[PDB]
From a paper:
In order to gain a detailed understanding of the conformations that McjD adopts during the transport cycle, we have determined its structure in the presence of the transition state analogue ADP‐VO4 (mimic of ATP hydrolysis) and in the absence of nucleotides, that is in the apo form, at 3.4 Å and 4.7 Å resolution, respectively. Clear electron density was observed for ADP‐VO4 and Mg2+. The presence of vanadate was verified by collecting the data close to the vanadium K‐edge, 2.26 Å wavelength and calculating anomalous difference electron density maps. At both NBDs, two strong electron density peaks of 14 and 20 sigma, respectively, confirmed the presence of two VO4 groups. McjD‐ADP‐VO4 is almost identical to the McjD‐AMPPNP, as the two structures can be superimposed with a root‐mean‐square deviation (rmsd) of 0.7 Å over 560 Cα atoms. In contrast to the MsbA‐ADP‐VO4 structure that adopts an outward‐open conformation as a result of domain intertwining (Ward et al, 2007), the McjD‐ADP‐VO4 structure is outward‐occluded without domain intertwining. We call it here high‐energy intermediate outward‐occluded. The TMD dimer interface in McjD‐ADP‐VO4 is formed between TM2 and TM5/TM6 from one subunit with the equivalent TMs from the opposite subunit similar to the McjD‐AMPPNP structure. In the presence of ADP‐VO4, the NBDs are dimerized with the P‐loop and ABC signature motifs involved in the binding of the nucleotide. The McjD‐ADP‐VO4 structure represents the transition state of a water molecule making a nucleophilic attack on the γ‐phosphate of ATP.
The ABC transporter McjD exports the antibacterial peptide MccJ25 in Escherichia coli. Four genes are required for the biosynthesis and export of MccJ25 (Duquesne et al, 2007b): mcjA encodes the linear precursor of MccJ25; mcjB and mcjC encode enzymes involved in the post‐translational modification of McjA to the lasso structure; and mcjD encodes an ABC exporter that is required for both MccJ25 secretion and self‐immunity of the producing strain towards MccJ25 (Choudhury et al, 2014). We have previously functionally characterized and determined the high‐resolution structure of McjD from Escherichia coli (Choudhury et al, 2014). Its core architecture is composed of a dimeric transmembrane domain (TMD) of 12 transmembrane (TM) helices, which forms the translocation pathway across the membrane bilayer and contains the ligand binding site, and a dimeric nucleotide binding domain (NBD) where ATP binds and is hydrolysed. In this study, we have determined its structure in a novel conformation, apo inward‐occluded and a new nucleotide‐bound state, high‐energy outward‐occluded intermediate state, with a defined ligand binding cavity.
Numbering used by the authors:
A (entry chain B): 4 to 579
B (entry chain A): 9 to 579
Amino acid sequence: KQKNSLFNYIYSLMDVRGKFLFFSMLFITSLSSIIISISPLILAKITDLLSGSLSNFSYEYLVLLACLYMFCVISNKASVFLFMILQSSLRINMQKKMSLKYLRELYNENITNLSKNNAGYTTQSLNQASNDIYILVRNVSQNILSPVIQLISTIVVVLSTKDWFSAGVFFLYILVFVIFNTRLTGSLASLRKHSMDITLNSYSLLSDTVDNMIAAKKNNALRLISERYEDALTQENNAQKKYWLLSSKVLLLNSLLAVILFGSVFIYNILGVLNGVVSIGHFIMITSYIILLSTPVENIGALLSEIRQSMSSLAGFIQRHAENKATSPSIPFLNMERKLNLSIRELSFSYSDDKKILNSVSLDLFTGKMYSLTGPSGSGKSTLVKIISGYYKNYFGDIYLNDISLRNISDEDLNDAIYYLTQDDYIFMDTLRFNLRLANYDASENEIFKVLKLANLSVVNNEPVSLDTHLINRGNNYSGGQKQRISLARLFLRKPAIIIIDEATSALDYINESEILSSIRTHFPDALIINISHRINLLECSDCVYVLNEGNIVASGHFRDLMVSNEYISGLASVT
Amino acid sequence: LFNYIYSLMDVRGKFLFFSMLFITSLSSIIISISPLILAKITDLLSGSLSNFSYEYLVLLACLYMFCVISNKASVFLFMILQSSLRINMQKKMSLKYLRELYNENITNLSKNNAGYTTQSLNQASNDIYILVRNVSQNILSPVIQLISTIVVVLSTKDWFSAGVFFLYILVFVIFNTRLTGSLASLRKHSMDITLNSYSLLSDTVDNMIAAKKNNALRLISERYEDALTQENNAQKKYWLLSSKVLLLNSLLAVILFGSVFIYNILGVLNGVVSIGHFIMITSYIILLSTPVENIGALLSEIRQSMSSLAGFIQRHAENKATSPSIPFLNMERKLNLSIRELSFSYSDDKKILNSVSLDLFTGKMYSLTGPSGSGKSTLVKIISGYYKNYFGDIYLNDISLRNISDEDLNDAIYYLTQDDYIFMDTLRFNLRLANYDASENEIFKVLKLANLSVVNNEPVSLDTHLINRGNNYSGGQKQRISLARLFLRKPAIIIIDEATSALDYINESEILSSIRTHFPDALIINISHRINLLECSDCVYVLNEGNIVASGHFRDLMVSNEYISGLASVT
Ligand SMILES: Nc1ncnc2c1ncn2[C@@H]1O[C@H](COP(=O)(O)OP(=O)(O)O)[C@@H](O)[C@H]1O
Ligand SMILES: Nc1ncnc2c1ncn2[C@@H]1O[C@H](COP(=O)(O)OP(=O)(O)O)[C@@H](O)[C@H]1O
Ligand code: VO4
Ligand code: VO4
Ligand SMILES: [Mg+2]
Ligand SMILES: [Mg+2]
């Protein structure tokens, strides 16, 4: 069942030009194997015409025979060049469609599954899959019809000349070969998959070390860094050497079998020629078939290996990327209001197992009101707002948005209703314009520049900020606070009912922090605001404060009514 | 270039490479006898065919079979040795890259992402492979087969055949070398666009959550689709030139070798040329395709894999400037810092530090504050030796920073960065980054001082696996990993750049207390917008638009300076 889905996926990557290039590749490979299967007869016909005549034969017929053999050789080589030209054209063609399908498939994946592996890994995963497709496309377009044609004609013709020992041992070889190899193909595929997986692990570790180079440099940790890569490379080599040995043995054994079987057919026909039983023409024909048969035997060997091993390695890729189990019963086009109230009822959560992060969070929040959420680091403030922001779906309890449950809200609608300002910044390596267009695609040049003022990013170091400012990897082109302001400017282009600020202002100075937080409430008057902070001034300003401790909400109400009652907030309000 | 590829080969690597060259050379000698054996077989068919001439035909047929068998055994043996050599050279190449990346400057490292550096290694691996191959297979072997052909056809005194044969190799080597550079440039430019495309994929995948939550599939997809379109167009441009060269080389071969075939046909029809010679000539025409092809590869492949590999060495080894300083263990126990008229620019277009003049001393805690964009991080980064292109001077007990080895500087100073750098590995590995030789106890002791020995009423294991960017942990728990590192280190200067922002007042004060206790003589610079650290410091420094605008005690500054007055009023 998964075998059919695999080839349908490869077929789908081919547009109209792609389908033609693939069929042209199949046709040309098939046509040339018909033509080249004729050539050992031509050679035999040349041999007899000369043998046993003392220059007494049609010289015009020898020339016609020599020219037909040349046509065979020329057409077969033209076919090889034409196939490889079509092959590269089809690679180029299928490449783009393959790569976008991956990116679009990655976008539709859940946060939990995305977080599992780094960019180094996902980047080399595409690499392996692209190459795997390539191999499969080739093996199908070249090693299916062509070797069958050349092997059928060879047994048919050798059977026709009533040579039973030759056609017998010939058919015996293809039988012993196809059996022996298939009885060792899976064993190679498994050794190859396991190797390619270790290879992903190795690229994963390289990107992990390169992304945190600064840390390893500053701690003078070259030894620790180098050793864990050297270990990964050693796991890679050993996994590769294990494949190499099996591959080398199969090849040696297949070679020795060919030498024993085809060698006998050669000695048999030698003795047949020496005892006048077999003609020289026929001897040359059997000699010519033995030589010609190597390439279709090679193409079969390849197919049996390459098809099974690229199918296995490609199966594994489709698995860890399309395990789509979501299908949450969402309301079709249920547009959300200006004023939305949140209701969290007995919410429970665990990231893995073994540990519960949220005990039984019961909360009730309303439109146009600002709420503060605090507690020690490890309580689960981020976790709670992430669940509200639909990062995670396997939660116990219920979350409502004016009677409508989160479970019945589409991830697109939820993301339009709520805007989460993350603890960590996510700045795209692109223009400032691009980073802000992330919030709203259709935003005009003015709407974007207006938003810079609101985030206090219209002027940097008494100089006007350009929308074409190129932003380096992780936006380290900008200061900690300037990074936070990019993410803040995004909120102003969006139009949400709920606004979550998870320690999203921590890197800003008192002036900026207050001015932006002011502009937020001004621009979004009816917006419900959840604010996560460890600071009294951000807690003071709220309509109500919530204290989270080890998963459970331990205290509620006004900050002033809590700064003496609650153990945590009294600990914060220890500021002289 | 070839010295670099040679260096990647150990003893097993050098053997495998020479075995590959030998076997390729030996088989081309053997297969160059082949058309003469075919001639003798054609001679016998139209000649001697007595009992002895039948036995001579069989011994001849066996020699041709030996040629064909030995040539194929050689092909299989070469590919076995090639893969063995690939495996062999692979590890040595990859570590050289990592070690080369570690020794690069922060400014150059920041220039490209992981997606880019990862696929950069990929391209160079493949470029080495091609070069190793074209050298071990397409140099001696085609020369042997082309020399012997012209020698033998010259010997049978056929001038038109050996003439047009030599003419082809001459026209071929000329025509192709004329277009090789044009192909290499089109290929390099394509491979570079390919890096740009992998760079954009890793950039999008690393910031997927942002694009997902902003429902930005269209903007994200469009950007990649554009990059892929720049990739296809760069690839199609190479494809066409490649396809033209191949079709023109094919048409030239059909015209020149076709003539040699027609000439010898007419020679056979007019009794001028024997059938035995006619076969030997077509047998040489057929045989010559593979050495012509291997020269076609050698000419084109050696040049294009040298161009793209030249680029890779350029961007990963150019460091013409190197200050021959070297004063060793520049400091012991105690340290003082002296910044004199420090000025700095990142891209020279704008000045970040105007003329910072500061003086700091042992055992004293100092606070540095100012608006976001003033340059607090910039200044401490320069103190931490991130950048060396600065005007002015920085001293560390009379010794200038310029004369302090990056190793010694990193042992004297410990910078706790604004952003956290958690390795995807065990907690043990993340802390062993600070001190390799640290014992299980030294590491666990440090976990307590970091307030990380217990998470959610459970004791923290040193074998805790930490996901990509340490997102397996809370913002504050990430900061505590970086803080736990400091307690394994032994510095004279300790910089805390907003390194406790994600921590609550209880832990911030509790850890900051254990820092001062464990490092009593340590000079401490603290960058904070909060006051619970500014009030605690022996002196406060206010940075505004590059220049240090205010100094002294915090209390004496919330009277004098309006910024410090306004900040304290947040009570
Ligand atoms: N690596 C960099 N490349 C270019 N410009 C940078 C870089 N890092 C920071 N900047 C610029 O230098 C200014 C000062 O740097 P920084 O220390 O990060 O500011 P802050 O006072 O917020 O700590 C920033 O406002 C920013 O525009
Ligand atoms: N993505 C995650 N995967 C696994 N564990 C996590 C994740 N995020 C946080 N945790 C765990 O959950 C707890 C609290 O998480 P978090 O919401 O980030 O904390 P905080 O109270 O600082 O907001 C921690 O004890 C931490 O180990
Ligand atoms: O790990 V937290 O308390 O959001 O900073
Ligand atoms: O970018 V700074 O947060 O150190 O103001
Ligand atoms: Mg949090
Ligand atoms: Mg800073």
